[PDB]
Structure formats: structure tokens, C-alpha cells
């Protein structure tokens, strides 16, 4: 496990070093663990399975 040790003078747009990751990061923005948003939480297994049986 090593750390990067290169100084990148240029900006993203010049094909040197990490241009792809730089473009993606400037496209999206801040860093969060969550991937999607505004989705309801699923119910528990007991609630999903043991519902009211059909008559």
C-alpha cells in the first residue's frame, strides 16, 4: 500500500494522470456513501411474509 507521489500541474482536459476520475468527480460533486435517494425503506421480513391470508 503506497501513496501517490506525483504533482499534476495541468487541469482535467489534458490527458495526463487522473483525467477520467477528475472529470467524473467534477461532474457529480460531493462524496456520500448513499447511491440513490428518495426511496422508501423496505419492510421487515415478518411484516412482508405473515400478512392477512386470503379467505
Amino acid at each position: 500500500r503506497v501513496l501517490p507521489c506525483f504533482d499534476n500541474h495541468y487541469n482535467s482536459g489534458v490527458l495526463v494522470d487522473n483525467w477520467f476520475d477528475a472529470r467524473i468527480n467534477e461532474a457529480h460533486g460531493k462524496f456520500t456513501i448513499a447511491v440513490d435517494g428518495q426511496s422508501p425503506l423496505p419492510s421487515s421480513v415478518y411484516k412482508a411474509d405473515y400478512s392477512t391470508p386470503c379467505v
Binding site: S44, V45, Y46, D49, Y50, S51, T52, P53, V55
Partner: protein, 442 residues
Amino acid sequence: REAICIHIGQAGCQVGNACWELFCLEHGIQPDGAMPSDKTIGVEDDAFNTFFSETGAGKHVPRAVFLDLEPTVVDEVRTGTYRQLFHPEQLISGKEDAANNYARGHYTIGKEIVDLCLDRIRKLADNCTGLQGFLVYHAVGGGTGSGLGALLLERLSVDYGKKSKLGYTVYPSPQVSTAVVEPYNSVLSTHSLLEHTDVAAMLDNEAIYDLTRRNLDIERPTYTNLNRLIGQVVSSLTASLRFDGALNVDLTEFQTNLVPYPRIHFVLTSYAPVISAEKAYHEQLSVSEISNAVFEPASMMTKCDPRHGKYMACCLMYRGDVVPKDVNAAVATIKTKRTIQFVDWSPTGFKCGINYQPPTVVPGGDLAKVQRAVCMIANSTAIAEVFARIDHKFDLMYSKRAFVHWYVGEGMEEGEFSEAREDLAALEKDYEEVGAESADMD
């Protein structure tokens, strides 16, 4: 007539949910405890009474207790769909778990909760007129199931005495495993369980996973499937009390027929028409085919191979459309087989039961609908292999006192390890001695 069910800890409560779902749907009691207005008319009937009691306004309430030390599972039952079915007093919950320590359940924490349990069981037993046993569901791998189950069975055995206690027990699977300390808890549980149980039925999740892969077509099973299978087994065994049949079987007959000597009370269980809905309509399912099915070890719900031992007694329960002549022809064919062997001191090896009610179909279930089924519980020397691997794992861990400081700190003498290990050694020798051929005495 009546039977009382005792559910302990997580496995026992979750299996209880599937059992009571099934018993409701088979009798026809709604989740709110009533029955439809058109189901009251007809002939005057009571068969539910083994499991339900009526107040007189027509609500049904069940003869069960649910016991846990952590709230979460009981709070889930309390907040679920069956809220109105159970009496709130019936759902008993402590504050904090036994943390996989048998010692914590038995000495420190269960002693406070045990008197409430005994008062509830007393309140149930006063409202009966033909109680014919206790049914107990628990797992021996966890702390509260082992410790409080043992303590409660000891107290019940002193207060009620001779009344029978039949256990359904989930033992640690031979290579699937869930916790590190399983050998200690299973050994210490089994030491108490030896004195205070009449028949113990052993289950392993690895076998029910194998059965659900081979017969059903389920790639990714979960505990609700296993618990529904267990519920079907319990319904098959208790059907003999509840419905008409040619050859009935009272709960005392299992204990009388299956146990030859008072320590030799551990039995193997299997169930025949485990089949999917798409497969079921291409094949007939005659008596002889399912009878042949119950003897292959791929059909068993416990991970043991009976070809490495000898059977001492078998009890075969048939429910549905079966005729006695076919049962006799099937049993005679089984007896002819060379891979099925009985100990020479048990010449008359079989007990039969025949009930007319076919198995019920559950709306979310995965089993097909079928006209007949057979369920077997049997006593065999192969079970000795199950104890030997747990005892070896105990010896491996105990050689370095790997975890003992938890048990000694939470209140247990170090001597108790050696006592239990010596008792299990004697049980192994009992199964060795009983299996010795009586021939060639001269």
C-alpha cells in the same frame, strides 16, 4: 385433549409464528380470533380445543407462552398482524439477552423471570380438563434458550411431575455454524436436558437447506421456509389427536413405543411429499412411493446417515387418503430391503397411525397441494455420531480454556464443565453398549 406449547428465544418464537399461522388456517380461525358467520352452522364441533379456548363471546385464544429475554422479537409479534389473537399476558419479554452465555441465562437473569413463567403456566393448567403434555420449542445453541429452558424444565418437572414433556430442538449443524461458543452451550444444555425430557427431536438447518435445494427449486431459502416445514411436521404429529382415523395415536403412545431405556430418548425425523407445484402434476404419489421416500437420508430433516447404524423403533404417521392394506404392503417391502436393519432385540419394529385429514395448503407456501402424506419419527443408534463431533469440538476448545473466564465470571463453577463432559461421555458409552450384538454368546 389439551396440549400447551412453550416457545423459548428467537428460533422458538419464529417457529411459533409459522406453527400458529398453520393451526389457524387449518381450523379456520381468523387472525383476530373469530370465525366467519357461516362457519358456525353445521355439526357441533370442538377439535380446535386442543389448541384454542373460547371465552363464550366466540373469540379463540391459544394455549401457549412465548418466552424471550430480548424484546425485539416479541415486540415484532405484538406489533404484527396477529396482535389481537394473543393475550398480552402471554407475550413475556425481559430487558436484555443472555449474550450466548448459558451461565447468564441460568444463574443471573433467568432466576428473576422464571417465576412469571411458572405463574402463567399455572394459570393455563388450571383452565384444562384433559391436559396430555407439554410441547417445547427451543434452540440449544444460544444462551437464553439453553439456560432458561433448562431452569424452566427443572421447575416444571418438580411441580407437575409425571406429565410428559416433548421437545423440538435445533442443534448446531455439523459444518454450517453461526456462533463460536455453540459447543459449550450445547453440552451444558444437553446435561440438564438428559434428566428432564421424555423424547427429544433433533433438527439441523443444513438438512432443511439440502431438502429445499433438492426437492423444491429454491436457490435462496430463508428461515420462513424452514419454519413452515417444521410447522407442517408438528401439525402432522398432532393431527392424530384432532381428526378421525382408522388407527389413532395418543401422545403417550409415542413415548411408550419409541423409548426402550430411559436415557435413549433422542429420535430422528423425516417428511415425505416435499414437492413443488410444477413437479406434482406429472407423477402419481402412491403410498409405496412416499414410504420408500421417507427412508432415504436425502429426505431427512437431521444431518445424519442411518446406514451407519441400526433402527430400534419407528413410528409412521399417515394422514389423508390411505388404506391400511397399502400401509401393510409398504412396510413389508421396507422390511424386505437389505439396507434397512433393525437391532436383533427389536423384532416387531413398527407402529402405525392413519388419519383422514389431508395436509393444509398455506397461501404463501412453496409446497404443492397433495392428497396424502406420511411423517416419521424414529430412534436409531446413528444419532451417537451427532454427539461425538460436538464433544470433540468441546475438547479442542477446552484444552486451552479458550473462553472459560466469561462463564466463571458470570457465576458458574469450573467443575460444571467436567461434570457435563463426563455425563456426555457416559451417554456415548450407553449408545455404544446398546448397539452391541447379542448373538455369539457361546
